[PDB]
């Protein structure tokens, strides 16, 4: 199939979480959340992530509580049955920008910004893809490419024509920890944050794997030895034939 239709292969960046013994970098997760809140959240929902999961990961119990309370959620009807709102709690899920699909399409030239809860696992390339997409918008499309009105060119997206315009620009965010908010830095951070949203069990999963693999390896090496011992009499057994008179 043509290269344009397939999309440009995303290269392999040196993510700090790549490697069997590597955990996520939690400071990057912390920063990624800010980029998500200040840039992405205007068009992208994050439906599967509950506030409580942030605690002990990227924020404190107090910080998350404040963040949740900035949003109103439907509450149980009062004594008389009329509906009533309520500030958010830790048990709630991060709210999305649109009330329904139709309202989301209207605000984006008819396109639908997907939920990002699983985006890292729902695309070949994973982090490499997401990062590359965000930092891969050329100022001008290659010569000859007739880009439809309202569309944008990005070599990493299949078909090259994507409905999301470039949204990351240098210093559009003021990192709370003082880090220089370059576009590639912000891309690196949200992407790390989105990987955690999709794989919250990552750090713990690899820790368990380490114990599991050590025990199983030992059991394997050990069983070989035990088997050879139990078979030694059979393996070294010897026969002699003396034809009967």
């Amino acid at each position: 199939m043509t290269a344009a239709e397939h999309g440009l292969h995303a290269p392999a960046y040196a993510w700090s979480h790549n490697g069997p013994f590597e955990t996520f970098d939690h400071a990057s997760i912390r920063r990624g959340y800010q980029v998500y809140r200040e840039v992405c959240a205007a068009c992208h929902s994050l439906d599967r992530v509950a506030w409580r999961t942030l605690v002990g990961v990227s924020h404190t119990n107090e910080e998350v509580r404040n963040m949740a309370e900035e949003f109103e959620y439907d509450d149980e009807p009062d004594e008389q049955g009329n509906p009533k709102k309520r500030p958010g709690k830790l048990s709630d899920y991060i709210p999305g920008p649109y009330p329904n699909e139709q309202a989301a399409r209207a605000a984006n030239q008819g396109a639908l910004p997907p939920d990002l809860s699983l985006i890292v696992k729902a695309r070949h390339g994973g982090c490499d893809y997401i990062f590359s997409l965000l930092t891969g918008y050329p100022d001008e499309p290659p010569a000859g490419v007739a880009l439809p009105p309202g569309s944008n060119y990005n070599p990493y997206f299949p078909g090259g024509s994507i409905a999301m315009a470039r949204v990351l620009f240098d210093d559009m965010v003021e990192y709370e920890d003082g880090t220089p908010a370059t576009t590639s830095q912000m891309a690196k951070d949200v992407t790390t944050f989105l990987n955690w949203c999709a794989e919250p069990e990552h750090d713990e999963r690899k820790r368990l794997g380490l114990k599991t693999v050590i025990i199983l390896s030992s059991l394997y090496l050990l069983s070989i030895w035990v088997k050879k011992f139990k078979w030694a009499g059979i393996k070294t057994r010897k026969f002699v034939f003396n034809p009967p008179k």
Partner: peptide, 14 residues
């Protein structure tokens, strides 16, 4: 595990 990942953990960030 925690030592190998020093600097990246939430403990360290806090």
């Amino acid at each position: 595990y925690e030592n190998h990942n020093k600097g990246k953990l939430w403990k360290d960030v806090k």
